[PDB]
Amino acid sequence: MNPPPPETSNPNKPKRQTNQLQYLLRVVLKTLWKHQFAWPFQQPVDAVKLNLPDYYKIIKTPMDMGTIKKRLENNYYWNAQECIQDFNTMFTNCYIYNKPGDDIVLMAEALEKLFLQKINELPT
Numbered sequence: 001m002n003p004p005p006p007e008t009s010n011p012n013k014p015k016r017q018t019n020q021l022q023y024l025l026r027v028v029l030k031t032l033w034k035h036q037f038a039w040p041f042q043q044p045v046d047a048v049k050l051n052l053p054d055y056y057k058i059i060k061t062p063m064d065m066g067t068i069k070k071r072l073e074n075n076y077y078w079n080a081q082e083c084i085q086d087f088n089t090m091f092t093n094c095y096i097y098n099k100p101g102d103d104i105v106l107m108a109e110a111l112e113k114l115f116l117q118k119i120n121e122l123p124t
């Protein structure tokens with residue numbers, strides 16, 4: 001089966017709204033979300049549907065833009081670096097499970113370059 005998805009709320013984790021975190025939701029995520037290659041990354045990997053039964057044997061810290069989106073909307077993060085780390089976990093998972101040249105990797109490679117472009121400059 002699929003594992004439980006990552007948490008999107010945690011009452012005992014301190015929350016914070018920063019200008020940078022508002023920007024990561026309004027501009028960075030919500031623009032990557034519209035990319036033609038974004039769809040595989042908008043929800044946790046459904047290893048059952050995709051017939052990838054070894055996915056969660058290999059990936060032990062799953063992450064996806066659907067989870068990141070809910071975390072941003074729920075003010076789950078303390079700072080932008082926490083959210084950026086989640087993006088990097090998602091890309092890294094993709095490169096770990098898959099191989100250079102795979103369709104999914106070409107998609108992640110493209111999103112990651114766009115992600116890096118958008119976060120090169122954050123609001124102050």
Ligand SMILES: Nc1cc(-n2ccnc2)c2ccc(Br)c(O)c2n1
Binds near residue numbers: 046052104
């Ligand atoms: N082999 C695959 C297939 C994926 N996919 C393809 C279509 N919908 C999901 C996929 C998605 C996100 C991440 Br992150 C991955 O590592 C993935 N790996």
